[PDB]
Amino acid sequence: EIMAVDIYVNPPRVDVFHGTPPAWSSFGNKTIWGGNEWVDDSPTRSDIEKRDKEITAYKNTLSAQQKENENKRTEAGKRLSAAIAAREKDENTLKTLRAGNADAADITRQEFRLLQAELREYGFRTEIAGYDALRLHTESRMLFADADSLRISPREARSLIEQAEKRQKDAQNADKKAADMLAEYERRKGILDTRLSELEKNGGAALAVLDAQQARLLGQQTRNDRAISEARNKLSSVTESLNTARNALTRAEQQLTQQKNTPDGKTIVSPEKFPGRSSTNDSIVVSGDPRFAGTIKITTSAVIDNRANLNYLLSHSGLDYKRNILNDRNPVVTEDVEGDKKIYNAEVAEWDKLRQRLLDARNKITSAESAVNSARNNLSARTNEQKHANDALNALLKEKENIRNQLSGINQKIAEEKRKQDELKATKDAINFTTEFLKSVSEKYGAKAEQLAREMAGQAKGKKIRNVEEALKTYEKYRADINKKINAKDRAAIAAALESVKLSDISSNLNRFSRGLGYAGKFTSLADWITEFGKAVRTENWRPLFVKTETIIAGNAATALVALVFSILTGSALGIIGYGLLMAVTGALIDESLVEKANKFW
Structure with missing residues (x-):
């Protein structure tokens, strides 16, 4: 593969804490730390109990937010773990690759391979940095809240507040850690962009060296085959004479016998x-x-x-x-x-x-004998030549063997560099189809939409599709919501539209997305799935469609599903209501969270 593709799609985000300081309704939102030195503005018994209620219910709010805020940090932490598993896997590979002195190029790719992994790890480290900021912010609020109480001594007051401020600042520092951190990330990605171009540049440079090398080899080949002709002929012109001689000798010895009898x-x-x-x-x-x-x-x-x-x-x-x-x-x-x-x-x-x-x-035998031997000593003269023709021809047949050998190697070499050079481009452009996807998603359905799309691909990556019944359970809960909102004619439209899909036409997109998102295996009953999906939007059955999904994708990976839905959205119209319903249904197979966000933007 050589690329990561998980990066470029869903890079760390880091969203800052949405607050809203409380403006207490009890006792005029006054606080005992508020100016009072030369007055008497005292909080009545009811004034206090109330204020306690407000502060109590409120803290709780920050509390719920926090518990859920942690969970997210946790999954991230999990992903950090995996991210590291790779960094190691790669790094390890790099070292041995150097222990054997593999080709500079093999290693250059490997390095670039560990780099992306490394960036990934850092990615999650950043995401953690944000969550912590959140925990700090929540805290300072928690304190601030507790800093008004009215049951406390102005002392405790001025202290509680001083504490809160100290904390909020820490939070603020946290904020600055993440942001810088988040910048660094891109500051590194840029280097990758450079590091890749170096790769591409030298990648072509090598190609050439092979293209031109197999050039001499070809011009050599011809010449050799030319030489072959010549020699093949000279062997003839030799053997030709060889017979004349042997004929001469045959006639000669013939004569000798005659005179000998x-x-x-x-x-x-x-x-x-x-x-x-x-x-x-x-x-x-x-x-x-x-x-x-x-x-x-x-x-x-x-x-x-x-x-x-x-x-x-x-x-x-x-x-x-x-x-x-x-x-x-x-x-x-x-x-x-x-x-x-x-x-x-x-x-x-x-x-x-x-x-x-x-x-x-x-004398008769005499003359004959000189004849004989003269012929017998021209034949030999000639045979010396035959050897020096056949041999010579053969030597050439050897280089024929050797050129072809040298060449084939090269052929293979060039093919290989090509497949590698291709794949990169294929995965690159793909990584660009998806980026170009999420954006137009932003252009047609606005903000919330993209954020969902990504966040869907956010989980997915790594996780397998959820259990059917456990899947339906989620959808059924969000039933009278995902159907409440706006589902009138829209429904019949969403369905008919879904039906009208030409698998044939959308197939290619699926292939591009899968790559861009990380899935490469094999889908199986897509023509049907879609069909079921349709009937599904008419008859609100959902089961068979849900059951079917467990049976369409090879590794049963959510990542492929998302890639699939991305394709269907690319071969229809549907609209904001449609985008919703789909992301919503699909989500209920990846992770319930996606559903909430789904039902919450339309």
């Missing part, structure tokens, strides 16, 4: 598992020596079946291999020189021709 190929891959062989039939012819002259028909074979040897060949000559791995060195192995030389050359040609073969074969 050539019959000769396999031998490069494995001499032993797949020996590389080659042979050629030669029809060598010899001449000269008839012992060998002919045509030798042989078959030159050669085979490679070992890494050791395969390597050597690829790295040497056939002739060499022939001469260094086989150690077939001298071509001449037999008596047939020509043949032996020709055969050898043939034997060697093989190695030469197989070498060329396994050789080329090697």
Whole structure:
């Protein structure tokens, strides 16, 4: 809530003692303390007894006034008590709120909260100050009265009076205590008015800080979402290439396998598992020596079946291999020189021709392998990039997570300050609807009217609606008065008028008042209530209407009722007779006192 609202409506009043010194009818209102020094003006026996009667009956009057004057002080005192209960409740809260180092603002509100409570307490303290003044005034009168007696000695006289004067003055001081006191009150309220504006000022100031903070956050958000696009694309342009590579490699390794499976190929891959062989039939012819002259028909074979040897060949000559791995060195192995030389050359040609073969074969796998690895080393090159795209994109997705987080917080923050900022205004303006109410009440029905209205809200606040039967009992007593006065056509008007109420239309006022007066719960059969209220003014039954009231308001608080009646008076005409009858009936459910004042002003 943050506001008090009980203040601003019904601030301390402090009404001074209405006197009227007595002008005794006995013995010429003379008093024995009156000048007599050089005369004889003596009070006869009857003169005295009479004077005694007057003074007696009179004192009694001040006496009754006083007893009832106390009672009021008493209830006040009770309210002072509660007023204090709060001051404490609040104060206590403030301290811990500081023990935790709550936000300057939380505390600023709390302080302002204890302030109003404090003002409240002081409020009642002032009201007490007045009652006491009254008791003093009554007293000095009591004495003054007793100071005329005529049964006393001029001594006792002059003393009784001196006493009275001393007392009346005290009373007068009392008067000045309250008044100053009553001024102070307002002198403090003003500070509240200041203290609240500070609150409102800084309240908006904070709002802004959030409004602008959530601004960067929004301009950030967009930018982030922009960046997201870019990166999301770059990941593509990367992955796009990633495939080209993998495709290249796929085709490459494809090629390698091909070259690795050539019959000769396999031998490069494995001499032993797949020996590389080659042979050629030669029809060598010899001449000269008839012992060998002919045509030798042989078959030159050669085979490679070992890494050791395969390597050597690829790295040497056939002739060499022939001469260094086989150690077939001298071509001449037999008596047939020509043949032996020709055969050898043939034997060697093989190695030469197989070498060329396994050789080329090697190269084929060679070229492929460089291809392969080149592709295999561009794919990787590319994958490094893919990471540095996906990762990069993700990092951004994180800030997305974080901006949204930072923002939501802020959203909430602003909403909250808003609901709080609103309520204040709502309760403020409300506190202004009621003030604006009581006044026009003064303008249409004059003085007595407002004073009643308030005094009704005066009790009410804190007390629950009175028991039905106990309620009717009060009204029935004030029956032939509240109906005596003026109730002719007026009655039929008051009724028909009451009936014609559009709950729908007056609903809002009820909501404003309730707040302005302190009730916030829930009404329930208002459409009916009013209706019953009507029939009630026609048939003077009163019971069901009274019974109904016990059953319309949540906490059964009088405060809501008053708020209700305030609404009905705001959606009709009725007039001074009407205002009366209502306040009167309603009062008989809050407190009998209100009725007296009701029946006493019209």
